Amino acid sequence: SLFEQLGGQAAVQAVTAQFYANIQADATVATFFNGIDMPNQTNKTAAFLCAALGGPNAWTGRNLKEVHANMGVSNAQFTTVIGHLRSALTGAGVAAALVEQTVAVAETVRGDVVTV
Numbered sequence: 001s002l003f004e005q006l007g008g009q010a011a012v013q014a015v016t017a018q019f020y021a022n023i024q025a026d027a028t029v030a031t032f033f034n035g036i037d038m039p040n041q042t043n044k045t046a047a048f049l050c051a052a053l054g055g056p057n058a059w060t061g062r063n064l065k066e067v068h069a070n071m072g073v074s075n076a077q078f079t080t081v082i083g084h085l086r087s088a089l090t091g092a093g094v095a096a097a098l099v100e101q102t103v104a105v106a107e108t109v110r111g112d113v114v115t116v
């Protein structure tokens, strides 16, 4: 699985932490996370990604389309966020092909997150 190729549950956690640090460092998207519990964000997104990447635990959290309804996220903002995931994975030493396979899994939620 892609979850295994990445190094496991701790590897996905670390990437997810860097992904959110990157998002918060970018003014075009950081505003969305004002007042949000970031350790919880990291934990829930890492769990979501572990499941999506073929890990052993199915996602039992909230429905992402309902979660992101009327948040006002555009495709350019989603694409920027995918860039933050790409840089987090690359920075973690993930090989290019695997970076791209992982990014591909995170695109499938574009329809649930983007609303405008």
Ligand code: HEM
Binding pocket: 029, 032, 033, 036, 044, 045, 048, 049, 061, 062, 063, 064, 067, 068, 071, 073, 077, 078, 081, 106, 109, 113
């Ligand atoms: C521009 C892109 C995105 C924005 C602005 C965004 C924003 C947010 C915010 C503000 C929350 C917290 C909502 C609340 O407090 O009720 C949230 C929750 C969440 N987001 Fe996103 N998000 C984005 C992309 C993603 C992506 C790419 C994923 C998965 C790969 C994702 C997965 C989640 C999950 C799993 C939760 C928590 C669900 C739960 O509570 O069970 N988000 N998002």
